[PDB]
Design an enzyme around this catalytic site. Structure first.
Site, PDB file in Angstrom:
ATOM      1  N   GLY A 207       0.850  -1.194   0.000  1.00 20.48           N
ATOM      2  CA  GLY A 207       0.000   0.000   0.000  1.00 20.48           C
ATOM      3  C   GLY A 207       0.882   1.239   0.000  1.00 20.48           C
ATOM      4  O   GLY A 207       1.505   1.550  -1.020  1.00 20.48           O
ATOM      5  N   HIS A 209       3.031   1.427   2.957  1.00 19.13           N
ATOM      6  CA  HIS A 209       3.983   0.985   3.965  1.00 19.13           C
ATOM      7  C   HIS A 209       5.204   0.373   3.274  1.00 19.13           C
ATOM      8  O   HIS A 209       5.072  -0.454   2.380  1.00 19.13           O
ATOM      9  CB  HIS A 209       3.322  -0.023   4.928  1.00 19.13           C
ATOM     10  CG  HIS A 209       4.252  -0.703   5.889  1.00 19.13           C
ATOM     11  ND1 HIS A 209       4.540  -2.030   5.726  1.00 19.13           N
ATOM     12  CD2 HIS A 209       4.913  -0.259   6.989  1.00 19.13           C
ATOM     13  CE1 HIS A 209       5.410  -2.338   6.667  1.00 19.13           C
ATOM     14  NE2 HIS A 209       5.646  -1.328   7.467  1.00 19.13           N
ATOM     15  N   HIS A 253       6.521  -8.040   7.074  1.00 21.34           N
ATOM     16  CA  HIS A 253       6.369  -8.489   5.695  1.00 21.34           C
ATOM     17  C   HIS A 253       7.625  -9.275   5.300  1.00 21.34           C
ATOM     18  O   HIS A 253       8.388  -8.826   4.458  1.00 21.34           O
ATOM     19  CB  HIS A 253       6.142  -7.268   4.788  1.00 21.34           C
ATOM     20  CG  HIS A 253       5.115  -7.474   3.735  1.00 21.34           C
ATOM     21  ND1 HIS A 253       3.764  -7.295   4.007  1.00 21.34           N
ATOM     22  CD2 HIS A 253       5.268  -7.798   2.428  1.00 21.34           C
ATOM     23  CE1 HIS A 253       3.135  -7.494   2.857  1.00 21.34           C
ATOM     24  NE2 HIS A 253       4.002  -7.805   1.871  1.00 21.34           N
ATOM     25  N   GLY A 260      -0.159 -12.060   4.326  1.00 21.93           N
ATOM     26  CA  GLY A 260      -1.497 -11.949   4.887  1.00 21.93           C
ATOM     27  C   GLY A 260      -2.064 -13.324   5.180  1.00 21.93           C
ATOM     28  O   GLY A 260      -2.605 -13.554   6.262  1.00 21.93           O
ATOM     29  N   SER A 263      -0.056 -14.627   8.241  1.00 26.26           N
ATOM     30  CA  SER A 263      -0.471 -13.833   9.398  1.00 26.26           C
ATOM     31  C   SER A 263      -1.859 -14.230   9.881  1.00 26.26           C
ATOM     32  O   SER A 263      -2.062 -14.348  11.088  1.00 26.26           O
ATOM     33  CB  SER A 263      -0.469 -12.353   9.045  1.00 26.26           C
ATOM     34  OG  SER A 263       0.856 -11.907   8.838  1.00 26.26           O
ATOM     35  N   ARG A 264      -2.806 -14.441   8.928  1.00 21.27           N
ATOM     36  CA  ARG A 264      -4.176 -14.867   9.242  1.00 21.27           C
ATOM     37  C   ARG A 264      -4.188 -16.293   9.821  1.00 21.27           C
ATOM     38  O   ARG A 264      -5.037 -16.581  10.647  1.00 21.27           O
ATOM     39  CB  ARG A 264      -5.118 -14.722   8.022  1.00 21.27           C
ATOM     40  CG  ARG A 264      -5.466 -13.264   7.707  1.00 21.27           C
ATOM     41  CD  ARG A 264      -6.476 -13.073   6.563  1.00 21.27           C
ATOM     42  NE  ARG A 264      -6.057 -13.644   5.287  1.00 21.27           N
ATOM     43  CZ  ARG A 264      -5.457 -12.999   4.287  1.00 21.27           C
ATOM     44  NH1 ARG A 264      -5.176 -11.710   4.390  1.00 21.27           N
ATOM     45  NH2 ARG A 264      -5.129 -13.645   3.175  1.00 21.27           N
ATOM     46  N   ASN A 297      -0.494   1.742  11.066  1.00 22.45           N
ATOM     47  CA  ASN A 297       0.807   2.273  10.626  1.00 22.45           C
ATOM     48  C   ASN A 297       0.894   3.739  11.036  1.00 22.45           C
ATOM     49  O   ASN A 297       1.893   4.163  11.625  1.00 22.45           O
ATOM     50  CB  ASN A 297       0.998   2.125   9.110  1.00 22.45           C
ATOM     51  CG  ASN A 297       0.948   0.697   8.646  1.00 22.45           C
ATOM     52  OD1 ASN A 297       0.288   0.391   7.652  1.00 22.45           O
ATOM     53  ND2 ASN A 297       1.883  -0.103   9.103  1.00 22.45           N
TER      54      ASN A 297
HETATM   55  N1  LIG Z   1      -0.597  -0.619   5.101  1.00 22.15           N
HETATM   56  C1  LIG Z   1      -0.332  -1.898   5.396  1.00 22.15           C
HETATM   57  N2  LIG Z   1       0.663  -2.170   6.282  1.00 22.15           N
HETATM   58  C2  LIG Z   1       0.971  -3.448   6.538  1.00 22.15           C
HETATM   59  N3  LIG Z   1       0.425  -4.556   6.025  1.00 22.15           N
HETATM   60  C3  LIG Z   1      -0.569  -4.263   5.170  1.00 22.15           C
HETATM   61  C4  LIG Z   1      -1.005  -2.992   4.811  1.00 22.15           C
HETATM   62  N4  LIG Z   1      -2.071  -3.071   3.927  1.00 22.15           N
HETATM   63  C5  LIG Z   1      -2.248  -4.362   3.769  1.00 22.15           C
HETATM   64  N5  LIG Z   1      -1.381  -5.141   4.493  1.00 22.15           N
HETATM   65  C6  LIG Z   1      -1.366  -6.602   4.594  1.00 22.15           C
HETATM   66  O1  LIG Z   1      -0.590  -7.153   3.544  1.00 22.15           O
HETATM   67  C7  LIG Z   1      -1.256  -8.324   3.031  1.00 22.15           C
HETATM   68  C8  LIG Z   1      -0.870  -8.538   1.587  1.00 22.15           C
HETATM   69  O2  LIG Z   1       0.426  -9.170   1.499  1.00 22.15           O
HETATM   70  P1  LIG Z   1       0.789 -10.456   0.558  1.00 22.15           P
HETATM   71  O3  LIG Z   1       0.583 -10.242  -0.895  1.00 22.15           O
HETATM   72  O4  LIG Z   1       2.232 -10.792   0.836  1.00 22.15           O
HETATM   73  O5  LIG Z   1       0.054 -11.786   1.013  1.00 22.15           O
HETATM   74  P2  LIG Z   1      -1.363 -12.446   0.744  1.00 22.15           P
HETATM   75  O6  LIG Z   1      -1.407 -13.721   1.484  1.00 22.15           O
HETATM   76  O7  LIG Z   1      -1.533 -12.651  -0.746  1.00 22.15           O
HETATM   77  O8  LIG Z   1      -2.519 -11.452   1.201  1.00 22.15           O
HETATM   78  P3  LIG Z   1      -3.882 -11.073   0.462  1.00 22.15           P
HETATM   79  O9  LIG Z   1      -4.451 -12.495   0.038  1.00 22.15           O
HETATM   80  O10 LIG Z   1      -4.776 -10.452   1.534  1.00 22.15           O
HETATM   81  O11 LIG Z   1      -3.651 -10.084  -0.693  1.00 22.15           O
HETATM   82  C9  LIG Z   1      -2.737  -8.036   3.250  1.00 22.15           C
HETATM   83  O12 LIG Z   1      -3.522  -9.215   3.365  1.00 22.15           O
HETATM   84  C10 LIG Z   1      -2.746  -7.272   4.570  1.00 22.15           C
HETATM   85  O13 LIG Z   1      -2.923  -8.138   5.679  1.00 22.15           O
END
Ligand SMILES: Nc1ncnc2c1ncn2[C@@H]1O[C@H](COP(=O)(O)OP(=O)(O)OP(=O)(O)O)[C@@H](O)[C@H]1O
Ligand SMILES: Nc1ncnc2c1ncn2[C@@H]1O[C@H](COP(=O)(O)OP(=O)(O)OP(=O)(O)O)[C@@H](O)[C@H]1O
Ligand SMILES: [Mg+2]
Ligand SMILES: [Mg+2]
Lengths: 323, 323
Positions: A207, A209, A253, A260, A263-264, A297
């Site tokens: 985003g 960050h 990250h 995400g 983390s979930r 953030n």
């Molecule tokens: N401003 C932010 N600061 C930190 N983390 C953020 C921010 N905005 C979104 N995120 C997190 O970053 C994740 C996206 O990262 P990533 O692509 O590595 O993994 P993902 O498993 O594919 O997640 P997603 O399926 O939700 O897109 C989001 O799901 C959210 O939890």
């Protein structure tokens, strides 16, 4: 600015009209102290004391000595703490009822497994339906006209959560950096086996960050796992520990993709080890989910903690109405 | 035994009858010296001097001092060495013609890419067709009514060979244990990301071959990479080095799955670095391929070297349809 018109409109009638004038000055300058305080006192008139407190707390990060923000904050600071403790006590009672039941419950636990996978992959743009996901996981055959990467994201989520329940939930001891890497090795393995279970070698953007530089991720993750096993974290409410655990990993990250999703999953490892059911952030909540992660953030983690707490209550309200 | 009848049948007529009669006493006892030797003299009557030599060499592993086997082997032994050198010189000439050409050749190199993948996966039981493989790799979309594992086997082979051509073929230096693990990390990653690029932790069976114990695989592989970079191996004919390289990895059997796919890729890394084209063992040859590997376990690796040499000649004959 238009804040002067927002006040004039609010002064005798025009409640819905004034609401747009406040947001306009907030879009035109999100660090406009006078607009935050006044919006804060405005949203308190609609009984939204939690939003008002966010606004006074926001206004005091910009100007720590603002007298109109300080006088209202000092009042609302302990009131919001009480309001938030009460919600966590409601959640604790619904968890008692849910953990006081079987066969009628088993039909919901099976339905929530596919529904969990469907939302954790859909929240990132995966176009597969629940029915297509059931086919992929039940049959092990491919779905026509949908990419292999999308279907491999599903195989990985299933493998990841099967590993957590099998090896991590009922395990005695501290959470290691290798446990996080094993979850990610399954989450992303079928999609990208070179990067799966391996940290970021490059600097990226999430985003607005900019997470730590790849040179610092290993030091930042050793500090994160210390925190997971720290006595301070053990004394936090499981909902607050689960939400903070998510935010800190998603802040760090550490991986190129699947942060995400990991983390979930980690968030649900925490909740389940504390006796709570696994929760699911639905695909419709992506906009809110990202807003409250951004808000954290900017300085306020509370909106994300409340977001997770509402997600846990809907999960508990699904297990209780189907009983 | 029935060898006495095999000789009586051969004595005046019955050539095809004595053939099945000779093989019966070989099924009833594969270490029956007299049978092997009589059979060797017999197959030499049909001008199969290579098979006769295998039989006398086999009979002398059982009984090293057998006079009828020794007299016949001391004769065949330099003759078979000459016969085998001549075939490797034919292969060297066809490699010169092929490496003395373009656009008409480019039409074959592209077709052979999907053809090697089709045969390297089909040889292990993969039911995907060449057309389904082209779709998986060109489109990145799944094929209906075929398993996700079969399609992930294809994504992995493509990734593995893309890594070899990109990072290994035109590289200066020694082949490391990590290069073998990186090939296997891609070959198996999309199918089994936990075991991909990681050695066997258990003891397994391959047909009737019991490879080394998991405790010994790392010592056995360090001895294997030493041999790949050894001066002795550099002085071998590239066809013989490629065949032995394959057999040694597959003997060791360092992984749970993907050993033959990795070995066939490594085999082609060798050939390509020596200026030979990459070769393909077709799915129809699985029975022969496994027989000659079984013979190499039993003591003679020449049948496997000749098998690879015939595979390289068919590959060269195909490329020579351009001239
Ligand atoms: N401003 C932010 N600061 C930190 N983390 C953020 C921010 N905005 C979104 N995120 C997190 O970053 C994740 C996206 O990262 P990533 O692509 O590595 O993994 P993902 O498993 O594919 O997640 P997603 O399926 O939700 O897109 C989001 O799901 C959210 O939890
Ligand atoms: N008796 C044997 N002794 C030694 N190696 C053998 C024997 N029979 C088969 N092999 C080798 O072992 C391989 C099978 O092992 P493995 O399943 O790990 O790999 P694979 O990639 O699936 O190969 P395949 O495509 O032939 O099934 C065969 O390809 C062959 O090269
Ligand atoms: Mg993503
Ligand atoms: Mg296999």
């Amino acid at each position: 600015a238009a804040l002067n018109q927002a006040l004039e409109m609010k002064r005798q009638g025009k409640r819905e009209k004034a609401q747009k004038l406040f947001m306009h000055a907030l879009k035109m300058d999100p660090d406009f102290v006078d607009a935050l305080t006044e919006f804060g006192i405005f949203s308190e008139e609609d009984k939204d004391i939690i939003q008002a407190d966010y606004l006074y707390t926001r206004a005091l990060t910009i100007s720590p000595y603002h007298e109109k923000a300080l006088v209202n904050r000092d009042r609302t600071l302990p009131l919001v703490e009480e309001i938030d403790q009460r919600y966590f006590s409601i959640i604790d009672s619904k968890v008692k009822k849910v953990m006081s039941i079987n066969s009628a419950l088993r039909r919901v636990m099976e339905e929530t497994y596919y529904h969990h996978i469907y939302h954790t992959v859909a929240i990132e743009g995966n176009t597969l339906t629940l029915s297509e996901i059931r086919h992929i996981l039940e049959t092990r055959y491919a779905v026509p006209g949908k990419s292999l990467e999308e279907q491999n994201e599903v195989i990985g989520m299933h493998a990841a959560m099967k590993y957590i329940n099998t090896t991590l939930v009922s395990r005695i001891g501290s959470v290691t950096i290798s446990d996080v890497l094993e979850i990610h090795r399954r989450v992303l393995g079928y999609v990208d086996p070179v990067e799966a279970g391996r940290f970021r070698t490059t600097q990226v953007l999430v985003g607005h960050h900019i997470p730590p530089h790849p040179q610092d991720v290993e030091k930042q993750m050793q500090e994160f796992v210390q925190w997971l096993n720290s006595e301070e974290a053990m004394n936090l409410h499981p909902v607050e520990f689960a939400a903070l655990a998510h935010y800190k990993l998603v802040y760090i990250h550490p991986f190129i993709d699947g942060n995400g999703r990991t983390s979930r999953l980690l968030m649900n490892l925490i909740l389940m080890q504390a006796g709570y059911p696994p929760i699911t952030i639905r695909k419709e909540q992506r906009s809110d989910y990202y807003h409250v992660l951004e808000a954290a953030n900017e300085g306020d983690v509370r909106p994300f903690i409340r977001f997770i707490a509402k997600c846990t209550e809907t999960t508990l309200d699904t297990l209780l109405f189907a009983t």
